[PDB]
DNA sequence: CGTGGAATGCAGCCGCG
DNA sequence: GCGGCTGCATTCCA
């Protein structure tokens, strides 16, 4: 098989690499890699190397990376550019694997673990690791086994062994309900003392050293804990065995008002699934704990248990171990879904970099570009330093707060990557500048044409139209790849149909499954060849037919990820190809583009509706625009439509046959106006919203920028059986809104958009009448408490102490002198509730930890003094008032008309 | 080290017979 | 007594 790398590290003058050799066996090797950097040389000197600017460079082959680094230093002291890949691991990787990397994940050891540390005090700080590790479940992808290490005796109790039989049983049976899929994949290992446990684990760890290390928070907890626990009990060199090259290093990170340390293990790639999630989930959740995410992704979280976790081992050691096992597994399941590990591997090997760098847009693109330029003997620019100079971004139209009955949204395809291609923006394509006129003079097409020789941008930047830019070329390549892969898909879906006929018209003749490439389209000599084929073996020809299709789908996703993570890199000063003028060129262009089309779409909808100067475009936002179709409906009559689905088709037909052509004509003019290298501005109809035909409901409403709601029926050609509410920015997406409320808000909105004023009123009056009878946890506002002691002057609010930080004070007091009371930990979230004066608590509000009910020590009184009026008014009424005001509706009859004023 | 647009809860001032 | 503003807090469109 092809030979690929697992991990690479540079340890002072040496390259340590773990890799899969030609026979599939894992290997590790040390190499005194000889790096090569480049310097500019005179034309007289003949070479095959030139920088991206065409200037000739002489190649310099150093004896060791140290010398190379030393050289770069001297070059900075003289003031001369030092071209070449400064990251020697990348270079080494480029040379050792100069060909499309093809790996077999089946040979890559992916470890997934979690630990348990019984702690009486607070959270057991990893940097200290003051308490014994009483459990470790470590899953190995190569063996597909869960290795459990159980501590039988510790200063916190001596327990019996964990029963697998009991673990398999049902809850109602006194069991732990550990799934039947992993019940036979468990290997239990109890121990008498912790030293015996740690040393056995560390030993197992040498036998099956992970290549990829994952888990939930394993990088900020698990790893540091185990490492420090071992370093303190045994010495530091023993703790270093966690690294296959016996090298570690502590890193420091400052998040908010404090810091945390992680341990770097040379020779391993740590992809903490919590970070992996946050980066590729693209679904911001209110809580990122495994229990929340697992419940939200798997529809079931981590096992349940009674009493505090710090006492679970002493109270029910059986559930304690099972809870540990299930924790590891829950993460494995989420991955069975999102497949973010694979997403990392295939992405890392594409760019040819350390898998853990998949977290950096910069590192990935620098790696991708470096490899391209290298193939054509070109030398990359020297990483230069740049002052963080904020530049303008996307244009967002200030909407007129109001209701909108019919709406049609349109979006531009990959706006930023597109503009880079169309204008041909790149550090080496800069040709010159030109007298810049007010952006508006460009949007209304009244400014002088920038130039008739160079591709231009509204910020005054001019680019060569002939030469191919380095950046643009590279994006285009990825775009072209995403396409060639949809091709391997939209085909492996049809070639799979000519095979799906296994029972439709089966045959016989028992033999091996037909040998053909399911990817590339089938042949006629093979289409007629599948006649005399066994219907039994015919199934395997569909396993690959279905496999290839997915293999394709799992191909474009990665490509769009790169495409989308380019502008950021390019806009990031630490990027090799960064350039402030280019970033502003891309971005300012986007603005002209979005407002130029706005004008066109308005000019057109007026010259089609007869109107003189109507504002059809009610909102814009970076790359999309929302249009009002009201005038278009009235131009035919709502009565002239059978049902809702009838006026919907009308608009769709109108957009594709009238709008698109208008839009494209328009954008083409702009391309000619800016004398761009190529027309790439493409819009597509996105949504179509409106109220149910013959219903007193309003279309939707806009409160302000980024804040609105629509009732959509057709999203990009996809008609819904039931209209879906598209609420954006409103308080329904606000995690801080108590359930009962945030719920009641969506229903308030729905009634507004599909039923009308009167319906909304009926609901509001109902909800208020049935508010007290709602659960106190449900009607409570959630908040995260940061920096509490800063406003805690002896148990009381300090310098303008926040509302949520106040209640924490009233709480810390009410339970001051109790360890059984749920402790409110800094950096976490808490429930908040107002209190009526005269309350035996001191303050006007109280807040306790989240996901937990108020301690029975003060629960009774809290549930007796919580100010119900103040509560509703602030979380329901106040925000609904925001919606109804903009929508021009009342949520309460007899309201005042003059309120809108003063 | 992955870049700009922008929309509020409170918490305290200041300005007026 | 409540009407302007400003305190950065915190989240979210692209």
UniProtKB/Swiss-Prot annotation:
Disulfide bonds: none
Entry's Gene Ontology molecular function annotations: 3'-5' exonuclease activity; DNA binding; DNA-directed DNA polymerase activity; metal ion binding; nucleotide binding
Cofactors demanded by this protein: Mg(2+)
Location of the region described as Polymerase in the Swiss-Prot/TrEMBL record: 380-902
EC number: 2.7.7.7, 3.1.11.-
Keywords: DNA replication, DNA-binding, DNA-directed DNA polymerase, Exonuclease, Hydrolase, Magnesium, Metal-binding, Multifunctional enzyme, Nuclease, Nucleotidyltransferase, Transferase, Viral DNA replication
Its biological purpose: Replicates the viral genomic DNA. This polymerase possesses two enzymatic activities: DNA synthesis (polymerase) and an exonucleolytic activity that degrades single-stranded DNA in the 3'- to 5'-direction for proofreading purpose.
UniProt-recorded name of the protein: DNA-directed DNA polymerase
Species of origin: Escherichia phage RB69 (Bacteriophage RB69)
Lineage: Viruses, Duplodnaviria, Heunggongvirae, Uroviricota, Caudoviricetes
């Amino acid at each position: 098989m092809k030979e690929f790398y697992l991990t690479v590290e540079q340890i002072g003058d040496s390259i340590f690499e773990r890799y899969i050799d030609s026979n599939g066996r894992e290997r590790t090797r040390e190499v005194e890699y000889k790096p090569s950097l480049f310097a500019h040389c005179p034309e007289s000197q003949a070479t095959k190397y030139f920088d991206i600017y065409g200037k000739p460079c002489t190649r310099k082959l150093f004896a060791n990376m140290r010398d190379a680094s030393q050289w770069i230093k001297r070059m900075e002291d003289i003031g001369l550019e030092a071209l070449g890949m400064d990251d020697f691991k990348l270079a080494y990787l480029s040379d050792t694997y100069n060909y499309e990397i093809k790996y077999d994940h089946t040979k890559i050891r992916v470890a997934n673990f979690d630990i348990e540390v019984t702690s009486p005090d607070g959270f057991p700080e990893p940097s200290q690791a003051k308490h014994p590790i009483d459990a470790i479940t470590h899953y190995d992808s190569i063996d597909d086994r869960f290795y459990v290490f159980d501590l039988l005796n510790s200063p916190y109790g001596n327990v019996e062994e964990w029963s697998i039989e009991i673990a398999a049983k049902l809850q109602e049976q006194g069991g732990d309900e550990v799934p039947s899929e992993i019940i036979d994949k468990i290997i239990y290992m109890p121990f008498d003392n912790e030293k015996e446990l740690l040393m056995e684990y560390l030993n197992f760890w040498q036998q099956k050293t992970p290549v990829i290390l994952t888990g939930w928070n394993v990088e900020s907890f698990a790893i540091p804990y185990v490492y420090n626990r071992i370093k303190n009990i045994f010495g530091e060199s023993t703790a270093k065995r966690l690294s296959p090259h016996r090298k570690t290093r502590v890193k420091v990170i400052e998040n908010m008002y404090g810091s945390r340390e992680i341990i770097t293990l040379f020779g391993i790639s740590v992809l903490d699934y919590i970070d992996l999630y946050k980066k590729f989930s693209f679904t911001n959740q209110p809580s990122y704990s495994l229990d929340y995410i697992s419940e939200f992704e798997l529809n079931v979280g981590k096992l349940k248990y009674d009493g505090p976790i710090s006492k679970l081992r002493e109270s029910n050691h059986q559930r304690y171990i099972s809870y540990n096992i299930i924790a590891v597994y829950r993460v494995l399941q989420i991955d069975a879904k999102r497949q973010f590990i694979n997403l990392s591997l295939d992405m890392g090997y594409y760019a040819k970099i350390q898998i853990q760098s998949v977290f950096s847009p910069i590192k990935t693109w620098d790696a991708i570009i470096f490899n391209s330029l290298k193939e054509q003997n070109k030398v990359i620019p020297q990483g230069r330093s740049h002052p963080v100079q904020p530049y303008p971004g996307a244009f967002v139209k200030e909407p007129i707060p109001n209701r909108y009955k019919y709406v049609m949204s349109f979006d531009l395809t990959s706006l930023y990557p597109s503009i880079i291609r169309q204008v041909n923006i790149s550090p080496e394509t800069i040709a010159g500048t030109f007298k810049v006129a007010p952006l508006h003079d460009y949007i209304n097409a009244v400014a002088e044409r920038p130039s008739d020789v160079y591709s231009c941008s509204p910020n005054g930047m001019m680019y060569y139209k002939d030469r191919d830019g380095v950046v643009p070329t590279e994006i285009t390549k990825v775009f072209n790849q995403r396409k060639e892969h949809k091709g391997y898909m939209l085909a492996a879906q049809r070639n799979g149909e000519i095979i799906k006929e296994a029972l439709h018209n089966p045959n016989l003749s028992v033999d091996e499954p037909l040998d053909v490439d399911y990817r590339f389209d089938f042949s006629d000599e093979i289409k007629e060849k599948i006649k005399k084929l066994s219907a039994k073996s015919l199934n395997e020809m569909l396993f690959r037919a279905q496999r290839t299709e997915v293999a394709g789908m799992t191909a474009q996703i990665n490509r769009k990820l790169l495409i989308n993570s380019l502008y950021g890199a390019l806009g990031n000063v630490w990027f090799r190809y960064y350039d402030l003028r280019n970033a502003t060129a891309i971005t300012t262009f986007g603005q002209m583009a979005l407002q130029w089309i706005e004008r066109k779409v308005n000019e057109y909808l007026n010259e089609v509706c007869g109107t003189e100067g109507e504002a059809f475009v009610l909102y814009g936002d970076t790359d999309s625009i929302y249009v009002s179709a009201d005038k278009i409906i009235d131009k035919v009559g709502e009565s002239k439509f059978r049902d809702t689905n009838h006026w919907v088709d009308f608009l769709d037909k109108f957009a594709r046959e009238r709008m698109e052509p208008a839009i494209d004509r328009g954008f083409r003019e702009m391309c000619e106006y800016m004398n761009n290298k190529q027309h790439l501005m493409f819009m597509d109809r996105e949504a179509i919203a409106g109220p149910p035909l013959g219903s007193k409901g309003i279309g939707g409403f806009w409160t302000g920028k980024k804040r609105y709601a629509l009732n959509v029926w057709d999203m990009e050609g996809t008609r819904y059986a039931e209209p879906k509410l598209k609420i954006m920015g409103l308080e329904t997406q606000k995690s801080s809104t108590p359930k009962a409320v945030q719920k009641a808000l969506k229903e308030c909105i729905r009634r507004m958009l599909q039923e009308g004023e009167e319906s909304l009123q009926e609901y509001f009056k109902e909800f208020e009448k049935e508010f007290r009878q709602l659960n106190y946890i449900s009607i409570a506002s959630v908040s995260s408490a940061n920096n509490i002691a800063k406003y805690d002057v002896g148990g009381f609010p300090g310098p303008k102490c926040p509302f949520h930080i106040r209640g924490i004070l009233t709480y810390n007091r009410a339970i001051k002198g109790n360890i059984d009371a749920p402790q409110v930990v800094e950096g976490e979230k808490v429930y908040v509730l107002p209190l009526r004066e005269g309350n035996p608590f001191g303050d006007k509000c109280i807040a306790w930890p989240s996901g937990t009910e108020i301690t029975d020590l003060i629960k009774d009184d809290v549930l007796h003094w919580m100010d119900y009026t103040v509560l509703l008014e602030k979380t329901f009424i106040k925000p609904l008032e925001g919606f109804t005001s903009a929508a021009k509706l009342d949520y309460e009859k007899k309201a005042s008309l003059f309120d809108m004023f003063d």
